[PDB]
Amino acid sequence: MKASGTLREYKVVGRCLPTPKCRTPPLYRMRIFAPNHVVAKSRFWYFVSQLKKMKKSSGEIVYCGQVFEKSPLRVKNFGIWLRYDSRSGTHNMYREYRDLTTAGAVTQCYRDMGARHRARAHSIQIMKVEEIAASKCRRPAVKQFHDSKIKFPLPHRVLRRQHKPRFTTKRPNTFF
Amino acid sequence: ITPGTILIILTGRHRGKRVVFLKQLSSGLLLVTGPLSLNRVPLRRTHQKFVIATSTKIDISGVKIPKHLTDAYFKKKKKYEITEQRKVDQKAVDSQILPKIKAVPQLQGYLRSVFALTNGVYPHKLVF
Amino acid sequence: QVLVLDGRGHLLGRLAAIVAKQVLLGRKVVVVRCEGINISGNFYRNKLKYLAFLRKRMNTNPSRGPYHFRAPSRIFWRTVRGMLPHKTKRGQAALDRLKVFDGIPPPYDKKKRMVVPAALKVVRLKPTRKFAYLGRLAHEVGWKYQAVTATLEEKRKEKAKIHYRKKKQLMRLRKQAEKNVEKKISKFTDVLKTHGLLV
Amino acid sequence: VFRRFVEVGRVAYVSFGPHAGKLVAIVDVIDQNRALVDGPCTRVRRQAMPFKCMQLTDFILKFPHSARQKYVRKAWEKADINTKWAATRWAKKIEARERKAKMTDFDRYKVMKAKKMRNRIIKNEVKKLQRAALLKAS
Amino acid sequence: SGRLWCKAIFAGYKRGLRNQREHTALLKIEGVYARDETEFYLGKRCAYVYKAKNNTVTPGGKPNKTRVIWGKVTRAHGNSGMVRAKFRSNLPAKAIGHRIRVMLYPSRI
Amino acid sequence: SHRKFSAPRHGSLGFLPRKRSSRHRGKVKSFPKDDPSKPVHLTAFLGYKA
RNA sequence: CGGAGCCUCGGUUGGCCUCGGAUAGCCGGUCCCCCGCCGGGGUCCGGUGCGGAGAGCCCUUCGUCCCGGGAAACGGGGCGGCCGGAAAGGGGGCCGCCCUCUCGCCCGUCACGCACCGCACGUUCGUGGGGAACCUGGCGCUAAACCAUUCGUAGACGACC
RNA sequence: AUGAACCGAACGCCGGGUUAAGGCGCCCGAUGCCGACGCUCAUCAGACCCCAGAAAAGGUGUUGGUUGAUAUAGACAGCAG
Ligand SMILES: [Mg+2]
Ligand SMILES: [Mg+2]
Ligand SMILES: [Mg+2]
Ligand SMILES: [Mg+2]
Ligand SMILES: [Mg+2]
């Protein structure tokens, strides 16, 4: 799997095929994040195969729908637990992000994990994502934004749109 | 392109000049004519493709062009000589067009002037 | 029709690429005050790289070896040449189109210098990074005309300062004239204001 | 020093992006390079917006960082931001820029004719002032 | 009584890194540097004007030494406003970095 | 292989272009640096070896 | 210095005649202020997504004809003097002249200019660079190098003194 | 870049369009996107399978993570008894 663009949160349920041994196999539900449902179901089967004695052929999907953010207009702090493979040995991580949507926080988690640890998407597997209150937040990089009277300027405005005035006589100003 | 609009001729000998548009001929060409007193433009045919149309129009719904001029009338015959009827029709249509355009301030001078491209003038950016 | 690019505050390679492409498009580009060209990285690394360039030399006959020019203008000219197919007629023609000078000669001091923001140091470099002046580096490596060029630059800057003072007083007189004549040019002003040329 | 500060309750002009050219009031700051914004009186929905596409102005209206769009409209209309923006010099030259882009061909000729005479009048007034300065000097 | 054609620079042929097709030419029209602005110039008539040694016939006037190679503008080329043009005869390589007139009578406004 | 016994190089490369001089009379490459404090005086002369 | 043509070479299709310089700060006025060979600093006032804006500025080319209104009367065109330029020197400014005008620009009236009958390289910087005499008149010009010979501070021959 | 074996893909002579692998500062067609998120100071930086060069060990350079501690009963410093 590759985290192409913003990920989407998928709710997927699956169960084994009915068998003469047991008529009703239990139904298992998982929360996953993937570019589309086609790879989402593949990820679900990968996790279920790794967890229980269920396989793609021995089981079947039931419902693979997309879970929308309940409050996409409220900024929320998300604590994300990770289990990824490094160059030698695997590690468990807890990282705090700050985003409007759970899927966006997961996408940002994939981006910065790959940036900081070279941990690619196939190496990273997500285990638990939840909304965490500011009091329960622990990482200072996220706690610093928890200020009612927050106020900061934009110090250095790097000149974008360089090539439109490409040949000009004016030295650009970075103070506004 | 609507009757009573202003056109810019780009190809013929009267290139770069602003002309008043009358109507569409039966041959598909545009029957255009400017005040000959202004920009020396007779009753002349022109092609729709080869003409730029600007967003400046006058209401000529109250004028009556002669109905005896058609594609055969403007068809080339075979040194060129001007017939008396051409002058008569040109005066007849000028007597109805020129007073109308003179209502709009600074319109006669605009028609007398020509169209040209200077430095930094780009047709895609400019809107006419 | 001829570009005059000020070399002050421009990154070496970043400016060279734009100049080389513009010249290959057929333009005539002249770069002025090459001693003000900045180079990214610390000054020691930049001079160390150029010292390595000096060491690289044909062994059997140094006369045929690489021609290490010490003047900032010729250093910039060489780095632009590296971005062109100078082995071909079009590449040599482009090099002929390009003219590079140290300082601001009288043929170009009376004109207005252009600045390319796409290669400006304060735009393409973080404020916390270190940079090296091409003129200082050239003097360190063997340029023999930093002082005389500096004196000439000082003299023309003083003369341009006097010219700018006269330009200022002309502008002030113009605005005083506009304020005194607005009564009889009002009809020639509102038209521009309604068409977005004087607001 | 600085005079414009990104704080809860400041409006900002948008240069590029989806809603370019429409003022939006920042409600809360999400991250270092992203903040929640909402323009209730200019038809801009509450959404995330990076700082690099918004130019903060010197207009601040007071409301809590979690207030709903209902209050933001109330604060915006009571502060009368729209008329203040219409009156500021910034929007005046923005609108003048739009006017000169909207300029037709016929009126462009009219402006060219008008500006020619205007330059002539200004130039002769300048030179008749210069000779007065010269005779005053000597 | 002035110029009635846009200015263009003959950048080069429609070429790959190691191959070039001479039937298509790349033109850089002055002023336009983006795809959303190169839409206007599609379908225009592009002409390369050059002089010669001996005289040649000139329509509507005395014969002189000027010759042209007519062509049209096919479609856009890249995000930087570069455009593709096809001429009746392939443009000679002498014209690299030289002015090409883009007419306006193939109008679409 | 290497040179068995190290020896100094014959001749000097500082005068490498050992060619007949283009000009007959020896010309002065650089005069001593001038200083305003000193009085005005000549810095060179021409004679003939006897 | 003060006319018409021929051959060849090509691209070009209005110019911008200038502060320096910062980018976690600038720009323009300003004296009610203090010092200096008008410049610098301090106070104050206007802007700053730069409007004294290269997203910018100037000229703008169809013309002639008559009369009228708006701007100019101090200016437009062309003969003498005064300075400004050295990094690869400015076809700039200033003061008088005998000639000339309300023509030059901005809006109104009048008509005309091969209206070459829809159709392409049109429109220029072009007295462009190089060459041959045709060319009428004016002001100034009658040289040097090489070979040969000698020299011998030099030298295979050239070369050099 | 370069190349008998690598990736795509196999070939009659051509026009139009679109792609694979690989690319889009310049050479050199194409990012002249107002591209997104972070890391990186190198006085030997780094820059794409085969591939053309590096190891064990260490860093109070800098970033993230794990675990165990102590602190308003007033800690780690730091200056004194
Ligand atoms: Mg030895
Ligand atoms: Mg020509
Ligand atoms: Mg394979
Ligand atoms: Mg093909
Ligand atoms: Mg390549």
UniProtKB/Swiss-Prot annotation, chain B:
Entry keyword set: Acetylation, Cytoplasm, Endoplasmic reticulum, Isopeptide bond, Phosphoprotein, Ribonucleoprotein, Ribosomal protein, Ubl conjugation
Main location: cytoplasm
Keyword Transmembrane: no
Signal peptide span: none
Modified positions (N6-succinyllysine) in chain numbering: K64
Family: Belongs to the eukaryotic ribosomal protein eL6 family.
Role played: Component of the large ribosomal subunit. The ribosome is a large ribonucleoprotein complex responsible for the synthesis of proteins in the cell.
The protein's name: Large ribosomal subunit protein eL6
Residues of the full protein shown: 147 to 291 of 291
Curated annotation (Swiss-Prot), chain D:
Keyword Ribosomal protein: yes
Organism for this UniProt entry: Oryctolagus cuniculus
One GO MF term attached to the UniProt entry: RNA binding
Family affiliation: Belongs to the eukaryotic ribosomal protein eL14 family.
Gene (UniProt): RPL14
GO cellular component: cytosolic large ribosomal subunit
Sorted UniProt keywords: Acetylation, Cytoplasm, Isopeptide bond, Phosphoprotein, Repeat, Ribonucleoprotein, Ribosomal protein, Ubl conjugation
Cross-link Glycyl lysine isopeptide (Lys-Gly) (interchain with G-Cter in SUMO2), where in sequence: K123
Domain of life: Eukaryota
Modified residue annotations for Phosphoserine: S138
Compartmental location: Cytoplasm
Function recorded in the entry: Component of the large ribosomal subunit. The ribosome is a large ribonucleoprotein complex responsible for the synthesis of proteins in the cell.
Keyword Acetylation applies: yes
This protein's name: Large ribosomal subunit protein eL14
GO biological process terms on file: ribosomal large subunit biogenesis; translation
Residues that bear N6-succinyllysine: K84
Subunit structure: Component of the large ribosomal subunit.
Sites of N6-acetyllysine modification: K78, K84
UniProtKB/Swiss-Prot annotation, chain E:
Biological process annotations from GO: translation
SUPFAM superfamilies given in the database record: Translation proteins
Residues annotated with N6-acetyllysine modification: K7, K62
Modified residues (N6-succinyllysine): K62
Single annotated GO MF: structural constituent of ribosome
Major place of residence: cytoplasm
PROSITE patterns according to UniProt: RIBOSOMAL_L35AE (PS01105)
Entry-linked Pfam families: Ribosomal_L35Ae
Protein family: Belongs to the eukaryotic ribosomal protein eL33 family.
Biological role: Component of the large ribosomal subunit. The ribosome is a large ribonucleoprotein complex responsible for the synthesis of proteins in the cell. Required for the proliferation and viability of hematopoietic cells.
Protein's name according to its UniProt entry: Large ribosomal subunit protein eL33
UniProtKB/Swiss-Prot annotation, chain F:
Record's compositionally biased regions (Basic residues): 17-30
Modifications made to the protein after synthesis: It is not required for incorporation of RPL3 into ribosomes.
Transmembrane residue ranges: none
Record's subcellular location: Nucleus, Nucleolus; Cytoplasm
Residues modified as Phosphoserine: S12
Region of interest: Disordered: 1-36
Subunit record text: Component of the large ribosomal subunit. Interacts with DHX33.
Function: Component of the large ribosomal subunit. The ribosome is a large ribonucleoprotein complex responsible for the synthesis of proteins in the cell.
Annotated family: Belongs to the universal ribosomal protein uL3 family.
Protein name per its UniProtKB record: Large ribosomal subunit protein uL3
Species this protein is from: Oryctolagus cuniculus
